[PDB]
């Protein structure tokens, strides 16, 4: 399950707050750290098609625990977030009020 995505707090299927498994935590992702490329990989990986909207600012609620401290530097084509290049991030630059969300289609 490591670096697998889920979407939680969404009203309809294939939408919600982004959470990506990191050890024993389903970690949220700061909107600032996210990208259309990573959102594309997430929608693909979740069998949810393509990105329609990226919503920042904890639109679908706030996560809890460790916010991701690596950035998913996806090229955009990858089948899995686990296959994207990553970069280390400094801790504490975002709160959960910036947890990113995605709406996928198909």
Author numbering: 1 to 4, 478 to 578, 1001
Question: Paper's wording?
Answer:
Infection by its etiological agent, PRRS virus (PRRSV), shows a highly restricted tropism of host cells and has been demonstrated to be mediated by an essential scavenger receptor (SR) CD163. CD163 fifth SR cysteine-rich domain (SRCR5) is further proven to play a crucial role during viral infection. In the current study, we prepared recombinant monkey CD163 (moCD163) SRCR5 and human CD163-like homolog (hCD163L1) SRCR8, and determined their crystal structures. After comparison with the previously reported crystal structure of porcine CD163 (pCD163) SRCR5, these structures showed almost identical structural folds but significantly different surface electrostatic potentials.
In this work, we prepared recombinant moCD163 SRCR5 in Pichia pastoris X-33 and hCD163L1 SRCR8 in Drosophila melanogaster Schneider 2 (S2) cells, respectively. The recombinant moCD163 SRCR5 and hCD163L1 SRCR8 were eluted as monomer during purification. Their crystal structures were determined and refined to 1.58 Å in P1 space group and 2.0 Å in C2 space group, respectively. MoCD163 SRCR5 was comprised of two antiparallel β-sheets (β1-4, β7 and β5-6) and three helices (a single α-helix α2 and two 310-helices α1, α3), whereas hCD163L1 SRCR8 contained two antiparallel β-sheets (β1-4, β7 and β5-6) and two helices (a single α-helix α1 and a 310-helix α2). A close comparison of moCD163 SRCR5 or hCD163L1 SRCR8 with pCD163 SRCR5 revealed that they shared almost identical structural folds (RMSD = 0.355 Å for 79 matching Cα atoms between moCD163 SRCR5 and pCD163 SRCR5, RMSD = 0.249 Å for 95 matching Cα atoms between hCD163L1 SRCR8 and pCD163 SRCR5). The minor differences between moCD163 SRCR5 and pCD163 SRCR5 were only observed in the long loop regions. MoCD163 SRCR5 displayed a similar surface electrostatic potential as pCD163 SRCR5 did, so-called “D/E-R-rich” charge distribution. The comparison provided a structural basis to explain why stable expression of moCD163 rendered comparable infectivity to PRRSV as pCD163 did, since their crucial SRCR5 shared the overall conformations and surface electrostatic potentials.
